[PDB]
Design a protein around this ligand. Structure first.
Ligand SMILES: COCCOCC(=O)Nc1cccc(F)c1
Length: 330
């Protein structure tokens, strides 16, 4: 089997991407944030505290003929941005892009934090990191990908995120029309439950490539590119008037600037992030200070290849016995 679904930016900045997901019988379609950095499939629901719902579409298990309570199971998750959610668990039929899993754990939120409530466009998350990170207790649950894997034509999924445009998540096949050149594959460590890999270095603009190992994770659920302070300082030093602002919470730059590209290494291959991808616009409405898309990972404890980086590539998440990542230009 295969599946193929379009993923769409939630706003003009590509702050996140939503993908329609069918849950239950008859189908209830919710728009979920596919997150290669976490391992829970959770939804706004008929159980979510009413004051914490503001425009989201909810899953109502009582209206699904295939929903079953997973008796005694609970879940509770915290994200790197400080957001959180928790609740109880149903099993149900879940389909993505024509690919169906029966018996998927659908984590029903009873509580969500303010950042979820305030984002009316995201109806929940679909985690695509390793199942070892799933937070269901007392019986940990599998991700949608792990449940689908044995049925797939190839044990893979691919992320093809757009810049200010829709893109695609495919399951079970690699669309050879979706990228240019060849795919370069690189080793993955699953020790922390992430798609963790080592970039071979970076360049700023037209500058020389610096060969240096940068461990980090491929995380579709993180907007920005978070890298070591040395690398980030080297990038922003090429933008006149850029500075790190403790008041704003990262690097800002004059909205009048033209940003340089940023290149990262994948083995001997190179992915180039155009400068425009690194513009996250005014820090507040009407400001002439703009927020940068490359930020320091200092204090996060891990480097994160978020959407700013991933959207410059066609990315293969190879879930074979020994997992690997692939990157191609596009
Ligand atoms: C085994 O789960 C123990 C509970 O974990 C709590 C928890 O917040 N975990 C978590 C947070 C963010 C991403 C992710 F993948 C996992």
């Amino acid at each position: 089997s295969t599946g193929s679904a379009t993923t769409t930016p939630i706003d003009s900045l590509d702050d996140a991407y939503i993908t329609p997901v069918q849950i239950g019988t008859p189908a209830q379609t919710l728009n979920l944030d596919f997150d290669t950095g976490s391992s829970d499939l959770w939804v706004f629901s008929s159980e979510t505290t009413a004051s914490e719902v503001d425009g989201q579409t909810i899953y109502t298990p009582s209206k699904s003929t295939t929903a079953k309570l997973l008796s005694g199971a609970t879940w509770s998750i915290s994200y790197g941005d400080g957001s959180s959610s928790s609740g109880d668990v149903y099993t149900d039929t879940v389909s993505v892009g024509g690919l169906t899993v029966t018996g998927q754990a659908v984590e029903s939120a009873k509580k969500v934090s303010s950042s979820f409530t305030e984002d009316s466009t995201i109806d929940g998350l679909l985690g695509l990191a390793f199942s070892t990170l799933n937070t269901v207790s007392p019986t940990q649950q599998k991700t949608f990908f792990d449940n689908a894997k044995a049925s797939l034509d190839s044990p893979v999924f691919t992320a093809d995120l757009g810049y200010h445009a829709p893109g695609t998540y495919n399951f079970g096949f690699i669309d050879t029309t979706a990228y240019t050149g060849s795919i370069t594959y690189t080793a993955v460590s699953t020790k922390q439950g992430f798609w963790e890999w080592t970039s071979t270095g970076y360049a700023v603009g037209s500058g020389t490539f610096k060969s240096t190992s940068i461990d980090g994770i491929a995380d579709t659920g993180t907007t920005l590119l978070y890298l070591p302070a040395t690398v980030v300082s080297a990038y922003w030093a090429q933008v006149s008037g850029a500075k790190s602002s403790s008041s704003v919470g990262g690097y800002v730059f004059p909205c009048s600037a033209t940003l340089p590209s940023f290149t990262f290494g994948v083995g001997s291959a190179r992915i180039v992030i155009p400068g425009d991808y690194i513009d996250f616009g005014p820090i507040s409405t009407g400001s002439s200070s703009c927020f940068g898309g490359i930020q320091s990972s200092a204090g996060i404890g891990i480097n994160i290849f978020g959407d700013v980086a991933l959207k410059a590539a066609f990315v293969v998440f190879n879930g074979a016995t020994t997992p690997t990542l692939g990157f191609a230009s596009k």
